[PDB]
Amino acid sequence: IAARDLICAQKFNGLTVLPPLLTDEMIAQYTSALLAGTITSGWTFGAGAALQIPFAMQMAYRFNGIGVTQNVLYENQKLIANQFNSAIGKIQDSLSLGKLQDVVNQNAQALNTLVKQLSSNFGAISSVLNDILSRLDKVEAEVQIDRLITGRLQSLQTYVTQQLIRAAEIRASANLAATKMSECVLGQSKR
Amino acid sequence: AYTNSFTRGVYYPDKVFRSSVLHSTQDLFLPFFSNVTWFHANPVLPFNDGVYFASTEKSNIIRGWIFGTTLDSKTQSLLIVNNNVVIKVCEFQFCNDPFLFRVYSSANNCTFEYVSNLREFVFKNIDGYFKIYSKHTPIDLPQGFSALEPLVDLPIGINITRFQTLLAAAAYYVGYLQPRTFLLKYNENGTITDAVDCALDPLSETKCTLKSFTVEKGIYQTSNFRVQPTESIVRFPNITNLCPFGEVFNATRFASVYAWNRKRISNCVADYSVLYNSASFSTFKCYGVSPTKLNDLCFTNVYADSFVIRGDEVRQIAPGQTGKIADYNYKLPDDFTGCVIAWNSNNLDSKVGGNYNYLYRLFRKSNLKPFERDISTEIYQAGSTPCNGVEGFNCYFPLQSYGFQPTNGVGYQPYRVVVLSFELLHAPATVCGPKKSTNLVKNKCVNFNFNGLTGTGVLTESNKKFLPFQQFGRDIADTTDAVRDPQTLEILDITPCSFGGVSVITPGTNTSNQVAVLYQDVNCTTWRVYSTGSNVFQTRAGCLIGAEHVNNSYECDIPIGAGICASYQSQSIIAYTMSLGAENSVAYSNNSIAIPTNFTISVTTEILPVSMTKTSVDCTMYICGDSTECSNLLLQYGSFCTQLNRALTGIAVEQDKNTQEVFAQVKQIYKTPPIKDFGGFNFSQILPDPSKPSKRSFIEDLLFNKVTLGFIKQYGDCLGDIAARDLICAQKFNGLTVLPPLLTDEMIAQYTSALLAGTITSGWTFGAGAALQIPFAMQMAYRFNGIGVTQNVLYENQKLIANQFNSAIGKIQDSLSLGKLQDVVNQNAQALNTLVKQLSSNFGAISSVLNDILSRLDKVEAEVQIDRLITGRLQSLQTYVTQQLIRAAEIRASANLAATKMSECVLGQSKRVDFCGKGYHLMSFPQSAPHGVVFLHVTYVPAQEKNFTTAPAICHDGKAHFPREGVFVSNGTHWFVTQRNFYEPQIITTDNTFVSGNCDVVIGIVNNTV
Amino acid sequence: LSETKCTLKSFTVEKGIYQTSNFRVQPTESIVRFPNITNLCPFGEVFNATRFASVYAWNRKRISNCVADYSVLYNSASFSTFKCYGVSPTKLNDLCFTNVYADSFVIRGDEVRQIAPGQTGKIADYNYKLPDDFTGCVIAWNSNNLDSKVGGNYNYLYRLFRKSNLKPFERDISTEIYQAGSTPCNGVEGFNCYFPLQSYGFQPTNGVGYQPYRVVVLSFELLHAPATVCGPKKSTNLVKNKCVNFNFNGLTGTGVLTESNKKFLPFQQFGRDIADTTDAVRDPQTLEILDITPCSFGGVSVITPGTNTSNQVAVLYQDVNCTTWRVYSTGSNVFQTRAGCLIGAEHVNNSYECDIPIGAGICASYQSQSIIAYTMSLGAENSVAYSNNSIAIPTNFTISVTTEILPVSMTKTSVDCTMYICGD
Amino acid sequence: STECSNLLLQYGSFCTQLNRALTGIAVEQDKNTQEVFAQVKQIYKTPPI
Ligand SMILES: CCCCC/C=C\C/C=C\CCCCCCCC(=O)O
Ligand SMILES: CCCCC/C=C\C/C=C\CCCCCCCC(=O)O
Ligand SMILES: *[C@@H]1O[C@H](CO)[C@@H](O)[C@H](O)[C@H]1NC(C)=O
Ligand SMILES: *[C@@H]1O[C@H](CO)[C@@H](O)[C@H](O)[C@H]1NC(C)=O
Ligand SMILES: *[C@@H]1O[C@H](CO)[C@@H](O)[C@H](O)[C@H]1NC(C)=O
Ligand SMILES: *[C@@H]1O[C@H](CO)[C@@H](O)[C@H](O)[C@H]1NC(C)=O
Ligand SMILES: *[C@@H]1O[C@H](CO)[C@@H](O)[C@H](O)[C@H]1NC(C)=O
Ligand SMILES: *[C@@H]1O[C@H](CO)[C@@H](O)[C@H](O)[C@H]1NC(C)=O
Ligand SMILES: *[C@@H]1O[C@H](CO)[C@@H](O)[C@H](O)[C@H]1NC(C)=O
Ligand SMILES: *[C@@H]1O[C@H](CO)[C@@H](O)[C@H](O)[C@H]1NC(C)=O
Ligand SMILES: *[C@@H]1O[C@H](CO)[C@@H](O)[C@H](O)[C@H]1NC(C)=O
Ligand SMILES: *[C@@H]1O[C@H](CO)[C@@H](O)[C@H](O)[C@H]1NC(C)=O
Ligand SMILES: *[C@@H]1O[C@H](CO)[C@@H](O)[C@H](O)[C@H]1NC(C)=O
Ligand SMILES: *[C@@H]1O[C@H](CO)[C@@H](O)[C@H](O)[C@H]1NC(C)=O
Ligand SMILES: *[C@@H]1O[C@H](CO)[C@@H](O)[C@H](O)[C@H]1NC(C)=O
Ligand SMILES: *[C@@H]1O[C@H](CO)[C@@H](O)[C@H](O)[C@H]1NC(C)=O
Ligand SMILES: *[C@@H]1O[C@H](CO)[C@@H](O)[C@H](O)[C@H]1NC(C)=O
Ligand SMILES: *[C@@H]1O[C@H](CO)[C@@H](O)[C@H](O)[C@H]1NC(C)=O
């Protein structure tokens, strides 16, 4: 069963995956707290104590924010609510995400090619240590084992360098997402 | 009968002086915390790989030792005895009870002779050398750490498996040694004072990896779970006969070279030791295999080729030779695997008068191909004219005859030649060798040898169907994973027996010595662990052993994974689930609102790196030192140092650019105000202090002492032994240097003081051109208008606001008693230190010192080693440069963020949420720090809210009215209109209101009077 | 400037500052320090002995306190085999050797190929074996004139049967009968049992492959511990506080020798650092201990206005404090900064903007015409007339247009690896 | 293989380096998640009405 799993083929050769510290349920808990705060309090909770305010009055504030008078909202409340409900319905209808899948695909591909590069000779007489050691004595075997060692070390070094570059990219994206959460969800943006 | 050693038994591995260092070595050591045996006041004990001996005596009772295999007169034994120190190697005949001088009865021929309160000895036997280390120590085995020093090494050259003690009211101890890895500590004087056994505990593995005797609180990854092989297996086919050595090597008459003979070998056992008493070979050379492995292998397609040639043509039977025989008679491939055997036969093939029975080919149009035979007899044309049979002046008969007389020179004597060709380790094989098979063992980690293929692992029954011509099966990584048993013909799968990840959690060695272990691939709900215990907690990250579970939820202390953390509390380690935060709720309704009635002024600090250290490298000095030979060999890699230096120079200029674009935003320098009277606001703690050797403020001074880090280091400064501990001019004796920043710290402080003066005297006008003066209180009133509060609110609470600001700015300097800035320094130091440390690697050569290599080998033999060293060291430098580039990019991102923050938070008022602090931003002050910048953010925070009833609109007389600013609130009886961020009710009248409705459509309208 | 030109691989240089090689120093003279020994090594007793031992009971003797001048063998001894393993034959005259043993025996002509680290056969298996990590030399020569007698010399024996292979440098001198059929063999012989030892029959009229050969094996260690067997080199005086070339007991190198304060234990001769290079040594004659320091140290930089403007340059020595001789050349003007010592530029007292950055707040520029060094200026000095009842308000305005430039893309490339690496 | 394990010790300062880099990445990921999602330390209930 180890000859087809492709996961414990990785970890029979020393490659392992570590779990995240926060579980998906805890993340969903955080997002639910954010939604409850923004719906009940407006943008007050993002600056200290959360103050309650009726939702229609909050949307009137947000209309004053974009340069329209608040009586325009109160005279079209039902049309606005219907439009919002229909729009969210369309959003969930459409859902029947390649940016997120690309990261997973890249990580899997990197680990799999790392496993695959173990069949190279690197200039020796074979890529199997046991075959080399079954036929040659110590002095004649060091010369081949050293070539294999150098090849596999440079494989690992290449993998680590690529991982560092990808991590820097992901950090840039995470900083952008944090700023978006801070400025679009906890307040109204003018940019 | 049994005792415990703790840290007893350690010797100097080498004879080289070291001091102030930690060194890691592998040798045969007595394992830490092992059980030794106790003998009171003799028996015969084994001698496995070496012995640790100790004797606590008071009257010189222990006297000596005897070593050997059997202690009779059929083998040699070693006697060491005091009585005069006497050392002999003889064929002694010993007694059952030897005591001291009736120790032995006879002494046959000898090959070695030398007659000449806690005593510790170590004995070893390597390469015919009996090595002894010893030490004495004045005072139930005691405790402590002492290191034994080399005593003697004797060339006895005997085989030892047992030993015994010689006795004339004492005790002695016996422990056995195993190959281990130790981390020893040398002190200032060169004495070994401490050691760590790496293969004892996971904590010991962590200590050996960190190369330190202390560990800081955290969680560390250790080696994967390892399992040892229990036993060994041999499985060859069943064969009885012996290979036909007599028919090949003892044949009556051999063939001619031009018609060499070939025969196949199969179904036999290759036991060539039967040739030792009858055949001596002048040539025996093998190509694809070592001569010392032949007894362990099996061979697939075995052919033997025989012929006869003359004495000095034997050198032509080799893969790549030219000559008469190699060209026209017999050629070997370049990829030949086999053996060539030749021996002189002047007694059989020589006759008086001349033997003319052996021929060879002298003329041919073109060279043969490997293993091609040509037995033609057609005349040879050598003049480009017809050659129809007749001979002479153009035509020769191709074949010539050897003439072998008994009285020739050795170069013209007959030689018999055999060539054996075979294949190894790919297909089924019927010519095995003289090894004996054993039983087949399944479902255990064992050592196996299947038809010469050796390995380790677990064997299981398989379901694959090999074709008859296949014997092995390979995986995608090119390793064998299936095999066919050569006797039962069943097929087995081979699986490795090492699997699973392991981690160790520690609170710090300076706190406690207890640890927890996480097994990441185990479900205890279980035996794949080093040790079980009283408490075993199962998580979804693995199985944790050594920590107690609890049901309450704290914040995280040490992250373990999947929502579980650990901490240290009679005192134990506990595991819990991390809490996200407090549990709160909001009293929401459709006609209720809360409005603040008071406020607080808060000051918070933010820290950002701006720069890192600039370095340069002299590659010739790092790679070659000062060897002219190495310097001349390095020129064949010349296009690789300029590249590294270009990258480093780019980084070095980038750092100064970062500092310039963060701090030199204003080119006008504003002097500090001569009179400091700003509506009652105290700035003395952040303005420049002129009563110091610098112009740094109080807070800046507190900041600069909180980071531990430019200087001129002279040659005479660390000339001599002082270079062996500085750790800085150890770097720069190898070509690594640090360049100073272009702007000094005083200049940076000058820029920050100009910024503060501008912002305190001008507001935000100086960041857009000419700086215009304005009283500070009016500036604060403007900043209050900025966040949506009226300016009269500021003017009526000026004393309270000023007092709050002063107390808040005092709290910051109180608290200052910065790991983000220290991390950069630590990383930059560590990288260079490991670069210096990597110069002790061999990289595959015979030594890591150029001078040692060049003191013993000459040019041609020395290039082969110097080139390996050069490749390794170039790789080290390239790795360092790449990591530096990545870190520089990260620092550039941080510096750009700091520049934007200086431009938007300090030179103006920000509307972006949570960009210049927490709350509603008012204003910001920068301070300079080592390699970074610190921002003091001042924000407005509403407080002390109260409840009110609210309506969206008010209907007077059939018309709708809207507040036009703020909200309508009611305190139970009356209706007022107020502002959002501060309670300030007023009368609802026609100027604070506008009418744009008919009072028929607004939901929630409440009618009142205006 | 020439080093900069060679590094850039160009005959022109643009205005700026360039890093050059570190400050190098040449060694003045050479030193040799061996121990004091008078005697000559016993070549006659080993190579000229009347009778050697058998291969199964080979002989071994220790060599110490002598000088190895093997040129004395040229007059009398010709060798058919001489091979060395851990060292080159042309370096033997400059080295010292630590633990020297000589092992001697006699074998037949065609077995000499079996005295090597990884050989198989009768002698390598049952009689005499070498390690895989052997460091030493093997010497063999024909001796048909001494060990051959008419009718057959039967004094030399070897072992033909043994249960298992010998370990390296192991001797076996037993005489017990050998069991070859798995039946009791209590002394009697025949059809299952053999006496383990066989005898060479050496007659003068044999083939060269059946003639006697005398074999000596020398084993020693190099460059780790104290040594008493040295080559025929002559010592010189000890020189301190100068960069010299040294040869201490065969270990060669360069640097400065200084008196030390370390106490080696009697069994130690050298000392190492974390980098695994030798740092301390013990003089083999006075028994004092010296420290070895490299004599190359310090960074150097060159400031140039551009070769198309002028050929004159300034040099910054980054590890020198002229307030001074660790410089290539002195000059009329020398300026001391906290970045190093600058030689070839005139200091001035007025402050400009930066032109060429030097470090720690100092820049340089081209001024009859010379290079000048000053401290960069941060900008103009202004002030604000602040009071508690005053304000300034603009009365006019200006419209300004400014430019900003940003990169968006770079060039796209591809590679054919087979074409770059292997051509065709 | 014990032989390869004993031969690899002449390259011992190259595994710790790789592992340090990977550990840095691993902690960076958890930091990213915290700084994106755990912005508010107060947990608010979903409204009852
Ligand atoms: C009697 C023991 C002498 C050994 C002294 C110790 C080390 C000398 C090492 C190598 C020198 C080889 C000496 C044998 C003569 C070499 C052949 C020649 O003459 O060119
Ligand atoms: C005719 C039998 C063919 C040999 C069997 C096939 C393969 C065995 C390969 C090598 C071992 C035999 C080498 C000949 C003996 C020389 C070694 C010695 O005695 O010094
Ligand atoms: C050792 O002594 C025994 C007994 O006389 C003798 O047979 C044997 O040949 C001797 N061997 C050696 C090497 O001296
Ligand atoms: C070790 O060296 C120090 C100086 O480095 C010295 O003070 C101390 O006495 C020495 N220890 C001894 C001699 O035991
Ligand atoms: C060859 O045959 C002869 C005579 O039968 C025998 O004495 C000798 O030992 C044999 N040698 C080999 C190598 O078979
Ligand atoms: C094989 O035969 C062809 C034609 O008969 C000839 O040209 C060629 O030389 C031969 N090969 C060899 C190796 O002689
Ligand atoms: C070897 O013996 C076993 C019985 O122990 C038998 O099954 C097997 O067939 C024999 N060898 C081969 C190649 O079949
Ligand atoms: C562990 O084993 C138990 C018992 O079968 C099972 O319920 C559980 O799903 C397994 N996995 C974990 C993570 O506990
Ligand atoms: C607001 O808080 C301050 C304390 O900072 C207090 O002195 C003041 O009385 C409070 N105002 C009211 C109206 O309670
Ligand atoms: C400002 O604070 C300092 C620090 O305590 C204090 O000495 C000074 O008196 C304060 N300013 C005034 C005007 O009191
Ligand atoms: C407002 O009322 C809610 C419940 O109606 C209460 O929980 C809250 O504490 C009140 N506000 C204040 C400031 O007390
Ligand atoms: C509400 O306001 C009215 C009008 O100012 C006042 O008479 C009454 O006392 C207030 N009630 C409370 C609870 O403040
Ligand atoms: C307020 O509106 C209600 C609903 O039409 C009406 O009955 C009531 O009389 C109004 N109040 C006043 C004071 O006009
Ligand atoms: C061996 O001794 C003889 C006679 O004493 C002498 O002639 C010969 O030169 C010596 N050979 C050596 C010392 O190699
Ligand atoms: C050493 O002695 C033991 C027991 O006497 C024996 O089994 C082993 O074969 C001997 N070693 C050698 C290399 O003969
Ligand atoms: C060598 O001679 C010196 C005197 O020049 C003497 O001090 C020294 O002891 C001699 N050699 C040794 C090893 O002592
Ligand atoms: C250079 O030497 C002078 C003379 O002693 C000394 O005052 C100064 O501190 C040293 N360092 C620098 C950077 O000038
Ligand atoms: C303002 O500047 C313009 C020149 O751009 C000038 O023509 C105009 O007279 C100025 N206004 C006053 C009031 O001086």
Numbering used by the authors:
A (entry chain B): 844 to 939, 945 to 1039
B (entry chain A): 27 to 67, 81 to 122, 125 to 141, 157 to 172, 188 to 210, 215 to 243, 262 to 618, 632 to 675, ...
C (entry chain C): 296 to 618, 632 to 675, 689 to 745
D (entry chain B): 746 to 794
Question: What does the primary publication say about this deposited structure?
Answer:
After applying 3-fold symmetry (C3) we obtained a 2.8 Å cryo-EM map. In our structure, LA is bound in a bi-partite binding pocket where one RBD provides a hydrophobic ‘greasy’ tube to accommodate the hydrocarbon tail of LA, while residues R408 and Q409 of the adjacent RBD provide a polar lid coordinating the carboxy head group of LA. This arginine residue is stabilized by π-stacking on Y837 and thus connects to the FPPR of the neighboring subunit. Fixed in a rigid position through these interactions, C840 can form a disulfide bond to C851 which additionally stabilizes the FPPR. The cryo-EM structure of BriSΔ evidenced exclusively particles in the locked conformation in which RBM binding to ACE2 is obstructed. Our biochemical assays thus establish that the BriSΔ trimer can adopt an open, ACE2-binding competent conformation, which however was not observed on the cryo-EM grids.
The S trimer glycoprotein is responsible for binding to the ACE2 receptor and for viral cell entry after cleavage at the S1/S2 junction and S2´ sites. Receptor binding destabilizes S, allowing S2´ cleavage, leading to shedding of S1 while S2 reorganizes to mediate fusion of viral and cellular membranes, enabling entry of SARS-CoV-2 into the host cells. The furin cleavage site is a four amino acid motif located on a solvent-exposed flexible loop of S7. The BriSΔ variant, originally identified as a viral subpopulation from SARS-CoV-2 isolate hCoV-19/England/02/2020, comprises in the spike an eight amino-acid deletion encompassing a furin recognition motif and S1/S2 cleavage site.
